[PDB]
From Swiss-Prot, chain A:
InterPro entries: Ribosomal_uL5, Ribosomal_uL5_bac-type, Ribosomal_uL5_C, Ribosomal_uL5_CS, Ribosomal_uL5_dom_sf, Ribosomal_uL5_N. Pfam families: Ribosomal_L5, Ribosomal_L5_C. The keyword Ribosomal protein applies. The modification N6-acetyllysine is found at K2. The gene is rplE. HAMAP family: Ribosomal_uL5_B. One of its GO terms (molecular function) is structural constituent of ribosome. Identified as a multicopy suppressor of the slow growth phenotype of an rsgA (yjeQ) deletion mutant. It comes from Escherichia coli (strain K12). This is Large ribosomal subunit protein uL5.
UniProtKB/Swiss-Prot annotation, chain B:
Binds directly to 23S ribosomal RNA and is located at the A site of the peptidyltransferase center. It contacts the A and P site tRNAs. One of the last ribosomal proteins to be assembled in the 50S subunit. The simultaneous presence of uL16 and bL36 probably triggers ObgE's GTPase activity and eventual dissociation from the mature 50S ribosmal subunit. It has an essential role in subunit assembly. NCBIfam families: rplP_bact. The keyword Ribonucleoprotein applies. The modification N-methylmethionine is found at M1. GO terms for cellular component: cytoplasm; cytosolic large ribosomal subunit. One of its GO terms (molecular function) is rRNA binding. Keywords: Hydroxylation, Methylation, Ribonucleoprotein, Ribosomal protein, RNA-binding, rRNA-binding, tRNA-binding. Part of the 50S ribosomal subunit. Cross-links to the A and P site tRNAs. Interacts with assembly factor DarP(YjgA). The modification (3R)-3-hydroxyarginine is found at R81. This is Large ribosomal subunit protein uL16. Is hydroxylated on Arg-81 by RoxA. The modification is nearly suppressed when E.coli is grown in anoxia. InterPro entries: Ribosomal_uL16 (IPR047873), Ribosomal_uL16_bact-type (IPR000114), Ribosomal_uL16_CS (IPR020798), Ribosomal_uL16_dom (IPR016180), Ribosomal_uL16_sf (IPR036920).
UniProtKB/Swiss-Prot annotation, chain D:
Proteolytically cleaved by protease VII to yield a peptide lacking residues 63-70. It is not clear if this is due to protein degradation or is a bona fide processing event in the strain used in PubMed:339950 and PubMed:10556732. In strains B, D10, MRE-600 and Q13 the only protein seen in PubMed:10556732 was full-length; the last 7 amino acids were sequenced only for strain MRE-600. It comes from Escherichia coli (strain K12). Pfam families: Ribosomal_L31. Its cofactor is Zn(2+). SUPFAM superfamilies: L28p-like. Changing C16S: No Zn(2+) binding. Binds 1 zinc ion per subunit. Only 1 ligand appears to be Cys, the other are thought to be His and either backbone amides or solvent. GO terms for cellular component: cytoplasm; cytosol; cytosolic large ribosomal subunit. The keyword Nucleotide-binding does not apply. This is Large ribosomal subunit protein bL31.
Swiss-Prot record, chain E:
PROSITE patterns: RIBOSOMAL_L27 (PS00831). Part of the 50S ribosomal subunit. Cross-links to the 23S rRNA. Cross-links to the A and P site tRNAs. This is Large ribosomal subunit protein bL27. The keyword Ribosomal protein applies. One of its GO terms (cellular component) is cytosolic large ribosomal subunit. The lineage of its organism: Bacteria, Pseudomonadati, Pseudomonadota, Gammaproteobacteria, Enterobacterales. One of its GO terms (biological process) is ribosomal large subunit assembly. GO terms for molecular function: ribosome binding; rRNA binding; structural constituent of ribosome; tRNA binding. Keywords: Ribonucleoprotein, Ribosomal protein, RNA-binding, rRNA-binding, tRNA-binding. PANTHER family: LARGE RIBOSOMAL SUBUNIT PROTEIN BL27M (PTHR15893:SF0), RIBOSOMAL PROTEIN L27 (PTHR15893). Gene3D superfamilies: 2.40.50.100. Belongs to the bacterial ribosomal protein bL27 family. The keyword RNA-binding applies.
RNA sequence: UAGUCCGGAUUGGAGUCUGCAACUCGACUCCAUGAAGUCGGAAUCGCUAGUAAUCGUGGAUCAGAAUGCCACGGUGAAUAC
RNA sequence: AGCUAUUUAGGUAGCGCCUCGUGAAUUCAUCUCCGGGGGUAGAGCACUGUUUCGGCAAGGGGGUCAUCCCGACUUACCAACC
RNA sequence: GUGCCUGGCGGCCGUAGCGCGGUGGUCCCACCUGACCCCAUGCCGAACUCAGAAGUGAAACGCCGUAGCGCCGAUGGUAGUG
RNA sequence: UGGGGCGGUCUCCUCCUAAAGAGUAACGGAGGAGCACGAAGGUUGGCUAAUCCUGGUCGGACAUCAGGAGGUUAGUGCAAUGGCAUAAGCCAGCUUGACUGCGAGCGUGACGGCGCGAGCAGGUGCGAAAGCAGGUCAUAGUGAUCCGGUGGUUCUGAAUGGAA
RNA sequence: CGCGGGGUGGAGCAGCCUGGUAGCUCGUCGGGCUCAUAACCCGAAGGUCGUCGGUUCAAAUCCGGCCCCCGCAACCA
RNA sequence: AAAAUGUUCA
């Protein structure tokens, strides 16, 4: 959570002279991050979902929410109301605890790293990336898993334009290409 | 032969055909064929009349057909007693009111079109007259 | 939206009270100040109003944004209403969950004579 | 943060090939001995030492030798 | 085949504007809430608006979405 | 249909009962409702029967 | 006792030699990569002794190029009512 | 010479309609004024459907192929959505 | 004498609502700082909630200008009709 | 019964026909019901869509995630119509009013019958409380009488006391 | 006109009924046995259910429209 | 127990 302290001094001043904001409240703040972990194959086995939820509980610092089917899909054979995904919304200190724990610990452990994409912005200053292997988080001791647990990390900020969300992460030296 | 692609209901009430038409003024082409007599144009009559004028101009210009059938006229089988269900749909007519612009043309001279609509009118049942697009 | 969400929450309670011809005790909670005004059954004219913006209340407090501040406010609305002779009244949460500051205001009014 | 459902939070310690005295909170309940961090990044200069293709003339000149 | 139909429910407005009603008298037998309850009227479970107080019928159009209400004056 | 009728008999000092139905093929237990007992004028427990 | 330090196909790079010349189309070496394959369906084949089976060596043609062919020896059975 | 029910449809029963007796409220009717709810005729096309042309236009069919990963071009021409 | 401000509650329900541009923070309002506890998340101080108030007028809200739209809408004629 | 036979239909609910109150026919045009629920009921508190576009591991047009547009084109146990955000739509906590005895006053039927119902007495539960609740958003999910069965109540019980 | 049932690998038949999976014999392809063929033995492939529209999360299946086919009725003067 | 066939000329 020391990166939050980084924000309060380093980031804000580096940003007010970068886009020329007339107010300190107009610079972007990182709202929240959502660690979604789509399991999908939970219909094949219920404890497949339990193994999935346990690993996601390790990644974050809290118990995730078992999301279900919004609508019934026959393409993937799921009725209206079947648990198929697991998400958790880090907000506040633990959000910062996680944000820093990703950029200084996790990404360096990504096999064949070459930098992230600056095109992963939806268009509202909100960044959304996707890790393939969850193994880059030291929580999993490697010798307890059996599935390639992939999870998406989507950051929502208060930025009004996607390019403003970009330079926000440039303040934290968020690795790209 | 125009026919509604997948209509809402299969059969329909007979109804009456009253009042003056709506498409009175010519709005697409330069010349038109406005109806004067009341009546109903079946799909086969609109189809036949179109060929009559498409040959008159050889193939050229634009021929707008501002009227569409969209009204299934049913019919019983030959020699059957009355009642026991409504008839089966046979053809599709289009109720025409006086002052209705049936066709519209453009690109050809007035003499050619007044001659083209002459052929067209000989195929239609309702007494039709020639009209032109005026400003406003 | 925080505001309008709260307002459509208040409508049900308000429509029911404005059709029973009941005098209502409404309360608007804000981060810094609490409002309490009593409205007649016709709906346009109020009878008794008392909030933390009034000097006669604001002066004797420490900060106008806590339970005890409202506890004094609830006390005042029952005292001013009784010089008007208003004993039976009805309560409106006005979109606020009856839990903290609003709850403090209410019981202070109940123990002050205003029976609602 | 309702209790009894979320795992523990201890201030864990992390090391690096750079000798990073890194103390971050996590739910491990161990002591992590890591190789790479943001201070011993193989990326920042790894880009220029990644692409070196687009040359065969000097490569070919080692065979002509003159 | 066709030929099946239901027997009429005799709905509609039983008492019109200005009529003197008695408490408990049915004003309108609507189906849904075509007519909302105004003042001194109750909405039954059949959605039947009746008079909760004997008086005079008063049709009005109030509300932000402009709906019809049937009120009754204390006559 | 599949829903057969049961007789909710009181556990009080009377032979009064309420009649209702029950989905025999989804509910293994007996119905338990604290209903009014129109004799001793109080609310008692009505366990089901046939 | 494991797709295992089994297995070696395949492929990228880097070389040596023969030969005017190795791209189509050689052999071999080095590093890396490292699949199929866990005793094989119906059916079928060789052999009775230093043979079967197994291991390694040489020769012819040949500039170079065989796991083929011709030839030699080491180890060395079982069974034939 | 209507409604409702009827092993009922050319019968019958109750109500409606006729007549006689008796008792009662300007009670009832026509008209002007006032208070009403309607949603039909007509009209309209935001809605549920349907229709034509024009513009934009994914998407599309067939061609020419690089006739390999990629993709491009063209078109006898079909076409949603706003 | 009052006027411009602002918050709440209603009347009236688009001539009142959208859009565009500007603008206000001493007050009021909002955001906001913090959260061991009251209380809450089918995960999370997002919301709910409490404790407080540095900072800000960005968002939101309010006010003004603007008709680009929604909206309101004659007179006359026409349709319909007793 | 557009002669009879054959085919079909017979009760109930929704729309149209139906001519702007109600009602209104045909072997006229379209569809459905013969149940379901212990919660899908009661209540308190809270929440509010469908479909597209952008980004994101497996993952594709569509699984789950975040954001935007949008606006109820969604949903409501079932057909259709009417209705619904104060939501009647969606989630959770707590319970049984899916309550007994009545019921001013009207609606609708020839009648049998059917429907709505403020309020009163008893007792219950939800909410701090105002109040709310005697089934379910409404309209279908149903059959008279006789005869006979089971339980309760001493009302009766052919001489009296019992009993059938 | 009217009525019942049916169409599914190349051929002839199951599966529908109670929706989520398409089986059966022959034929067919490859190997084997034989001097060669048949027969026999081993292994595998091959059908989006006539078609169109809708219903549901989902259509071989449910509903409706149409075609081909088979059977049935076309009686009373 | 099963156990069929073999184009014409030369």
């Amino acid at each position: 959570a020391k990166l939050h302290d980084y924000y309060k001094d380093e980031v804000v001043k580096k940003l007010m002279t970068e886009f020329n904001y007339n107010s300190v409240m107009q610079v972007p703040r990182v709202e929240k991050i959502t660690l979604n972990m789509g399991v999908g194959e939970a219909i094949a086995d219920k404890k497949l979902l339990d193994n999935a939820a346990a690993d996601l509980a390790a990644i974050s610092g809290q118990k995730p929410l078992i999301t279900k089917a919004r609508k019934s899909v026959a393409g993937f054979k799921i009725r209206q109301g079947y648990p198929i995904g697991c998400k958790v919304t880090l907000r506040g200190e633990r959000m910062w605890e996680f944000f820093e724990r990703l950029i200084t610990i996790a990404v360096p452990r990504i096999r064949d790293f070459r930098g992230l994409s600056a095109k992963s912005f939806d268009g509202r200053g909100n960044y959304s990336m996707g890790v393939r292997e969850q193994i880059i988080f030291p929580e999993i001791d490697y010798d307890k898993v059996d599935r390639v647990r992939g999870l998406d990390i989507t950051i929502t900020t208060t930025a009004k334009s996607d390019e403003e969300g970009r330079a926000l992460l440039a303040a934290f030296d968020f690795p790209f290409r | 032969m125009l026919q509604p692609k997948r209509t809402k209901f299969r059969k329909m009430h007979k109804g009456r055909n009253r009042g003056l038409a709506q498409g009175t003024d010519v709005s697409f082409g330069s010349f038109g064929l406005k109806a004067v007599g009341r009546g109903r144009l079946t799909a086969r009559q609109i189809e036949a009349a179109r060929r009559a004028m498409t040959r008159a101009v050889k193939r050229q210009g634009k021929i707008w057909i501002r009227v569409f059938p969209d009204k299934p006229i049913t019919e019983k089988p030959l020699a059957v007693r009355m009642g026991k269900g409504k008839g089966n749909v046979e053809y599709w007519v289009a109720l025409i009111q006086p002052g209705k612009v049936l066709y519209e043309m453009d690109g050809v001279p007035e003499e050619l079109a007044r001659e083209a609509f002459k052929l067209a009118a000989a195929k239609l049942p309702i007494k039709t007259t020639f009209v032109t697009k005026t400003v406003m | 939206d925080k505001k309008s969400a709260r307002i459509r929450r208040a409508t049900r309670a308000r429509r029911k009270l404005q059709e029973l011809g009941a005098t209502r005790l409404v309360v608007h909670r804000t981060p810094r100040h609490i409002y309490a005004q009593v409205i007649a059954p016709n709906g346009s004219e109020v009878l008794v109003a008392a909030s933390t913006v009034e000097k006669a209340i604001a002066e004797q407090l420490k900060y106008t944004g806590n339970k005890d501040a409202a506890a004094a406010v609830g006390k005042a609305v029952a005292e001013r209403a009784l010089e008007k002779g208003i004993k039976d009244v009805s309560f409106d949460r006005s979109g606020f969950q009856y839990h903290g500051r609003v709850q403090a205001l209410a019981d202070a009014a109940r123990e002050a004579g205003l029976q609602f | 943060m309702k209790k009894d459902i979320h795992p523990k939070y201890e201030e864990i310690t992390a090391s690096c090939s750079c000798g990073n005295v890194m103390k971050i909170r996590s739910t491990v309940g161990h002591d992590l001995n890591l190789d790479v961090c943001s201070k011993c990044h193989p990326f920042f200069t790894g880009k220029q030492r990644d692409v070196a293709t687009g040359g065969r003339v000097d490569r070919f000149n080692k065979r002509f030798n003159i | 085949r066709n030929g099946r139909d239901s027997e009429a429910k005799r709905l509609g407005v039983k008492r019109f504007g200005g009529e003197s009603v008695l408490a408990g008298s049915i004003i309108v037998r609507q189906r849904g809430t075509k007519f909302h309850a105004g003042a001194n009227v109750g909405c039954g479970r059949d959605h039947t608006l009746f008079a909760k107080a004997d008086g005079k019928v008063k049709f009005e159009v109030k509300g932000p979405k402009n709906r019809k209400f049937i009120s009754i004056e204390a006559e | 249909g599949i829903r057969e009728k049961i007789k909710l008999v009181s556990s009080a000092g009377t032979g009064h009962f309420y009649t209702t139905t029950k989905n025999k093929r989804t509910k293994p237990e007996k119905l338990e409702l604290k209903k009014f007992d129109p004799v001793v004028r109080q609310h008692v427990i009505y366990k089901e029967a046939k």
